[model samples]
Target: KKSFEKTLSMYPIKNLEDLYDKEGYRDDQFDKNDKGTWIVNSQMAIQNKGEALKIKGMLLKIDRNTRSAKGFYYTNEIKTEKYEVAQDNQKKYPVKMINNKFISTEEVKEENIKKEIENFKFFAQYSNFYKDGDISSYSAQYQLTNDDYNVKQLRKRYDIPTNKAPKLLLKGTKKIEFTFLENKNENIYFTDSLHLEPS
Candidate 1:
């Protein structure tokens, strides 16, 4: 007497396009790499000392396998030497009085720029994907704590009316769900749902 065998269905992955459509994602935001992997580029802004600082970065090496997927997020570094500021006054020799001493306008500007950069840093995350029923989902957690001297300094430098710091220092976890749907032609389409949990 022999026992019957059961077979499991393979994960549906026809092509790169079948994974995600451009409906919710921007056309220029994501693309397929040479290794047939998908890379997504994204940007966001934060406020530092009443100034807007832009953070640009990408998520790459997204791998979708039999039952799970993973990806890494990274941000472009902020270079102090590449920092620049425009002079408001057209004077050839501009000077500013600070702390009862005359200081070169450019020097003061550079000092301020360095201070801003010192107080701000980007957070990177690695998200792991899992499958539940027919829905594939992933979650990423971002946290900012007073343990970092820079984060502490940032909190002291700014007067945050709320108990929490600004968006840059937010502590939260983002969960994204992708529900796969099939069209009449048997093509796979997915709709994504985002859930943000704050701590």
Candidate 2:
């Protein structure tokens, strides 16, 4: 535990030569302070306007490192906000970039539905996608079976127009009903199985 200020006092005071005049040391500290102020200002914008919901406010503290940058930030008039260390890689989903133009196979469609439901079930455990926490009841009541769950997530994740043919088909079921998030307990029914466009 070396004291920064105590070490400076040990230097020669005869000629008034300052040992604290290390190259860029003072400037680097000042730069770090300046950066802290900048981060706080950004936090203020998020607090007042609700621009960034995840950003923590800046206060009189600034800590920096190579791995990541984090601080306390709040740009609100009241200044009654709670403090949190804001950082990155928060809302990330590990998605694989594949050809979106590929056609669905008969078995793959069933597999996709199963996969989506499994994913959703896992997602509901930690996060709240619905008002109630019981996903099983929600599945049994609103979404009774696998078919019901298929149309639900599919409608949400993809763009399938009701009047026109869906560019994609699941399990070769062109007569699909995709649900819209805005409209709960509803599904957009595609009239004809022939509406499914072939790849």
Candidate 3:
């Protein structure tokens, strides 16, 4: 067997210097740092004020028919100010985006119920009506398709308010921390499905 070896004659090529400085080489050895995921579990530490400030006058409504393990929408980036990284989660997770949206779809059965609705499944879509590229913050609509799952049914199950219409409400911050290192591979410690939170 021959030992692996290669020799290349240096050929003068234009802009070769620019090619050498692509910076990707430096990145390859950086251990691919600066990328991670933020996982929000119930125990996530949060400052307790319990004051409503999310969206003034907006009540976050939970749809009963849509209530189940499937309702939570889980999905990321860097913004140090709005988030804090979990110290316990290490190189396997160095940093993370405060990306978990734990709004109405977090699977609470009836503890927060305010009302209910009884009807066939219908689809509802909410729009923000923004014309500018500069989005203010996370204030998107949660759509629900009325099916066998009815509003009252969901409200009763989750103990939350459920009118025929979805309402806007403020949410309390509740989350847990984890290592973001393997974010690309996903920590999956847990996951909810489609019939989940509208976020």
Best by lDDT: 1
Residue-level lDDT tens digits of model 3 in 46-119 = 11122211110111123223221112221122223344565222111111112112234333344422122111
User: TM per model?
Assistant: 0.20, 0.13, 0.19
lDDT of 3: 0.21
Whole-model lDDT per candidate: 0.26, 0.24, 0.21
RMSD of 1: 20.2
Q: How do all the candidates rank in terms of TM-score, highest first?
A: 1, 3, 2
Backbone clashes, each candidate: 0, 8, 41
Q: lDDT ranking from best to worst?
A: 1, 2, 3
**Which pairs in model 2 have colliding backbones?**
44-75, 56-73, 57-72, 57-73, 57-74, 58-72, 58-73, 58-74
lDDT of 2 by residue, 79-122 (tens): 22454445332321122111211122223334543353233211
Candidate 3 Cα errors over 4 Å, as ranges: 1-38, 41-138, 142-156, 167-199
